[PDB]
Design a protein around this ligand. Structure first.
Ligand code: HEM
Ligand code: HEM
Ligand SMILES: N#Cc1ccc([C@H]2CCCc3cncn32)cc1
Ligand SMILES: N#Cc1ccc([C@H]2CCCc3cncn32)cc1
Lengths: 470, 465
């Protein structure tokens, strides 16, 4: 006795009122708070009167599980129009982020061994580790200059450059000295273009191209300029590795995009496509969780001390083999789960479902956009007693951690992001105390990704008073 | 056995695509055509989705009849928000065109006697007649200066200036010097302001102020600025007459607005709002049909003769007694009806219906906005056999509800008789002196900017007979 779809509670909003609001305010920064309010009012599930087709909103781990079982051989998420529009506009391919069906599987099966797999991690992680080391050392050099052995800064810029750097090293095998040196104009341009892309994504996202073409011509013009810039940044990288490997096939490991070029299992343009997604994808999605993690430790000193204690003890064996940072810092790994529980950069998981299923005892038809809202999911008091508490212990005691998604589609950059975040935190922790007066909740803001709206003024205080030694 | 509301056919599109359409287009110039191929395609009645509120579009006399039968004691047209908002902005009252309820009735009842009465019509018809005599007289001077004894021009300018001159005389007893001379900057400003006011109205009309406010704030600047020019024109007129009456009450007839001022049944403020409506309302609505009529006569020389023959035959007693023109030119009175059938100035009739009723075996809830759509109505080839035929004879036996281009009930156009007199009188004098021709045989594209209007001025030749 399952309830018919038509009998599911309904988000009260006109698709058109949202759209005009996006037109007026040039964005939709509270999306997540609204959604959250909506589950709060209506409960675990609801449907949204969309532009015609059925779409449903869920927030329970149970629902993710079922969603995973219904994953075909080709799971589907929605065609993000403005992004694809650009690719077809310049005649490019699309990486796994923008693909569906046979083309997606083909690519993903050829990217898993070299981006995601555990044998890939083990080659690229010591490279990340070196970048992570330079971050702290450089931050320590600046810290010890100060009479008080501390520095108080907005760490956002430098975190964003750490991830431009750690990533570009792992990906391409070049250091672009953006750690312990000022931003370049090339890196500042890139960052800005990525911001413009997301903002202009949100403006064009909520309406068909046929209509947005004539009511927002210059949003489109903005979006393509931003991409043109993101693409110039990423094609410059491609050109350099590509010419280099034309003349010398290395004996040793020189990064992820080198494996893909060597192994030649993918066409040049298919590699170009997937390189871009990795260069663009590796920056913001990693930086905000680091930032938010830095904030949570800063304002939970007792948890900070615990994570340090663990990192101080594993110090010696991690500088011996940096690869042991995965298995030896499980509290730190847990802290990340916790940061992403509260601050889920990917706001929601998306499936355009290909077979009737049952969620929450309602019946879901073939082609329903099911959408899993990870903000409300993370804050469910029933599943996460005291959700407002940052308590990484919570995780040590299943589908509760799913911020990278699930199944075969699960984030290709998961382990790179994980390594990058984990390793930076490890070195910061053994070297510095992290502090703030700014102990009130940071207001998160939606522009395609869920990001902090402000940056807290953080303090890094040296524990030792030495440049190398913790 | 009565089908309930939502059983009715549904206009394809939505208010939102409409808004945005209008935003980018800056207009809705095809509304009449768009509504027409909706009647063609869906039937003689349909609903339009306002997402909650209730609208019905109808095209048949049969239905108009029932609409009237359900006029209240206070028949309602909808609040025309932009126009009313201007009255709020500047602190003036509303006239009869924008009122509803007891305030409407109180105004209208004190308005008909001097604006619409047959008795009124006798007092001002000879004034109108003077101006239309000056029109042909002037046209004739120019025509005879030419070797072929004819002049080919675009008359739209001089026609508009005619209706300004004739309204001003009828309304204020004042005679501007516009007929047979040059447009003054005031009149030109005035015609511009009016046409911008219509333009801007369409741009704000189809969305609530809560949207137009931020979507189209320049269009609001544009709308009010147009009205400021319109209120400057009429208030100048009011001011003049107010002063002359404070000083001397005349023993004789000197205009419509004088009779209102001398009676003082209505308040000064109320007299002002109505006088303004009559001044703005007596220009584009009269002038466009009068042009369309000239075009159709040029297009149908054999209808032009019949009419010319009637006017020459009635010339003498009309010259001697102007007032008789209402009764001695029945074919010319029919031609007006004919023009208004094919070219209805006010595109739709309108009632926010007070009681329940049934139209076309559909149930229509109280509070519903029922619109009659006259362009379709008059083009109903099943009701007017050979509908694109200009045939004045069509109207020689009057049933009534085939001719509703001024509306119906207590609400029917207050300016109706002044309108008909002006158009009647001009054509009469033009017919006795000139033949009217064009090579332009092809239909003229109507355009919708709040009123339905030609989008082109056909080039006309006038030849002295
Ligand atoms: C903590 C940071 C990150 C989070 C929270 C995250 C999360 C996600 C999520 C939720 C999805 C959708 C998964 C699904 O539909 O099952 C996804 C897809 C994807 N992400 Fe990430 N990601 C992160 C970092 C990265 C990085 C650094 C990269 C690139 C180096 C990356 C590249 C991708 C790609 C290529 C896809 C498409 C995968 C596919 O469709 O197979 N992500 N990610
Ligand atoms: C060919 C000439 C005209 C046409 C086709 C026309 C059309 C109309 C229509 C269709 C209505 C609506 C009545 C209703 O909804 O029941 C109306 C009302 C009105 N008209 Fe005209 N009109 C014309 C000339 C004029 C003139 C010259 C004036 C000014 C002297 C004028 C002033 C008004 C006013 C004040 C109303 C409001 C009546 C009320 O609600 O009581 N009209 N007209
Ligand atoms: N091209 C491209 C591209 C740019 C940014 C991303 C980021 C931002 C969107 C959500 C997400 C999950 N994993 C990575 N990402 C992903 C792809
Ligand atoms: N104020 C004013 C005002 C200005 C123009 C008009 C015109 C044009 C709109 C429909 C109509 C019916 N009778 C006259 N009119 C009516 C009122």
């Amino acid at each position: 006795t399952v309830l018919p779809f038509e009998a599911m509670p309904q988000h009260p909003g006109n698709r058109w009122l949202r759209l005009l609001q996006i037109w007026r305010e040039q964005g939709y920064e509270h999306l997540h708070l609204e959604m959250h309010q909506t589950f709060q009012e209506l409960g675990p599930i609801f449907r949204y009167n969309l532009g015609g087709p059925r779409m449903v909103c869920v927030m329970l781990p149970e629902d993710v599980e079922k969603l995973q079982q219904v994953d075909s051989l080709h799971p589907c998420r929605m065609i993000l129009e403005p992004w694809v529009a650009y690719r077809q506009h310049r005649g490019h391919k699309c990486g796994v982020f923008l693909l569906n069906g046979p083309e997606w599987r083909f690519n993903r099966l050829r990217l898993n061994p070299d981006v995601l797999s555990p044998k890939a991690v083990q080659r690229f992680l010591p490279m990340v580790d070196a970048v992570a080391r330079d971050f702290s050392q450089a931050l320590k050099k600046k810290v010890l200059q100060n009479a008080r052995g501390s520095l108080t800064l907005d760490v956002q810029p430098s975190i964003f450059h750490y991830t431009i750097e750690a990533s570009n090293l792992a990906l391409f095998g070049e250091r672009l000295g953006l750690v312990g040196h000022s931003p370049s104009s090339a890196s500042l341009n890139f960052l800005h273009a990525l911001e413009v892309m997301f903002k202009s994504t949100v403006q064009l996202m909520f309406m068909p191209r046929s209509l947005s073409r004539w009511i927002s011509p210059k949003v489109w013009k903005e979006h393509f300029e931003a991409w043109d810039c993101i693409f110039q940044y990423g094609d410059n990288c491609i050109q350099k590795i590509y010419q280099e490997l034309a003349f010398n096939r290395p004996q040793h490991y020189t990064g992820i995009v080198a494996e893909l070029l060597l192994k030649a299992e993918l066409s040049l343009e298919a590699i170009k496509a997937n390189s871009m997604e990795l260069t663009a994808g590796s920056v913001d999605t990693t930086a905000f969780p680091l930032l938010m993690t830095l904030f949570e430790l800063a304002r939970n000193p007792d948890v900070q001390q615990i994570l340090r204690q663990e990192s101080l003890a594993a110090a010696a064996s991690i500088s011996e083999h940096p690869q042991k940072a995965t298995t030896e810092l499980p509290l730190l790994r847990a802290a990340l789960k916790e940061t992403l529980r509260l601050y889920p950069v990917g706001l929601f998981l998306e499936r355009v479902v290909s077979s009737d299923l049952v969620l929450q005892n309602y019946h879901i038809p073939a082609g329903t956009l099911v959408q899993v809202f990870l903000y409300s999911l993370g804050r469910n008091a029933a599943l996460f007693p005291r959700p407002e508490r940052y308590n990484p212990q919570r995780w040590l005691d299943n589908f509760h951690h799913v911020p990278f998604g699930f199944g075969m589609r699960q984030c290709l950059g998961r382990r790179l992001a994980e390594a990058e975040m984990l390793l930076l935190l490890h070195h910061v922790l053994k070297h510095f105390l992290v502090e703030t007066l700014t102990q009130e909740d940071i207001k998160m803001v939606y522009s395609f990704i869920l990001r902090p709206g402000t940056s807290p003024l953080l303090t890094f205080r040296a524990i030792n008073h030495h440049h190398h030694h913790h």
